[PDB]
Amino acid sequence: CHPCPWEWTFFQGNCYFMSNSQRNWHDSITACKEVGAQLVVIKSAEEQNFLQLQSSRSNRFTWMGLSDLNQEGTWQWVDGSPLLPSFKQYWNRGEPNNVGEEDCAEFSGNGWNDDKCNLAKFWICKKSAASC
Ligand SMILES: OC[C@H]1O[C@H](O[C@@H]2[C@@H](O[C@@H]3[C@H](O)[C@@H](O)O[C@H](CO)[C@H]3O)O[C@H](CO)[C@@H](O)[C@@H]2O)[C@@H](O)[C@@H](O)[C@@H]1O
Ligand SMILES: [Ca+2]
Ligand SMILES: [Ca+2]
Ligand SMILES: [Ca+2]
């Protein structure tokens, strides 16, 4: 037994998967579901701080489970939870700007950015760690 599957990352009881391939936002949701996970939903500042660091180090644009697809300007996580006021400090200066219609969020540099959902980027899946 192992708390997390091979190649996954463990942080505070959860296992994360930083993909090595790219998909568009919608296809990233599916990829995670197939492996019993979910396109990463950030529940705490600590989590955010941990993922932001790994992502900036990866030097890769990465999708998170966040979007304003149903209602422009209103950011909602894929689990259904809404984006809280304390998390809005993480958008990159000048973001989100919806330039060209960007309804999906990604880790970019030191913060978040909204981009076209049909673009292919890397993604992070999240699921509970196994205790044993
Ligand atoms: O056409 C350029 C676009 O630039 C600004 O919009 C930003 C921009 O972000 C880029 C992008 O993430 C990548 O090139 O890395 C850069 C630095 O590492 C970063 O600045 O482009 C994306 C993609 O269109 C946008 O989502 C961002 O908001 C704005 O100036 C736009 O008005 C301008 O069209
Ligand atoms: Ca829109
Ligand atoms: Ca938008
Ligand atoms: Ca943007």
**Alpha-carbon separation of residue 59 from 9, 81, 90 (angstroms):** 17, 28, 17
Given resolution (angstroms):
2.4
For the chain, the structural domain boundaries read 1-132
Name the residue at shortest CA distance from atom 4 of ligand 1.
99
Distance CA 28, CA 30 (A): 5
113 CA to centre of ligand 1 in angstroms: 9
Residue 35 backbone phi and psi in degrees, to 5? -105, 25
Ligand 1 atom index nearest CA of 114: 26
β-pairing verdict for 62-67 and 104-108: antiparallel
Residue 96: asked if its preceding bond is cis (omega within 30°), the reply is: yes
CATH architecture of 1-132: Roll (3.10)
The dihedral sign for the CA sequence 90, 44, 80, 53: positive
Distance CA 65, CA 106 (A): 9
Cα 104 off chain centre by: 10
Locus of tokens 């989590």: 47
Residue 74 burial (CB < 10 Å; 0-12/13-18/19+)? Answer: exposed
Find the Cα–Cα–Cα–Cα dihedral 87, 88, 89, 92, rounded to 10°: 120
Q: Which of 23, 13, 101 has the alpha carbon at shortest distance from 61?
A: 23
Is residue 20 marked as binding? Answer: no
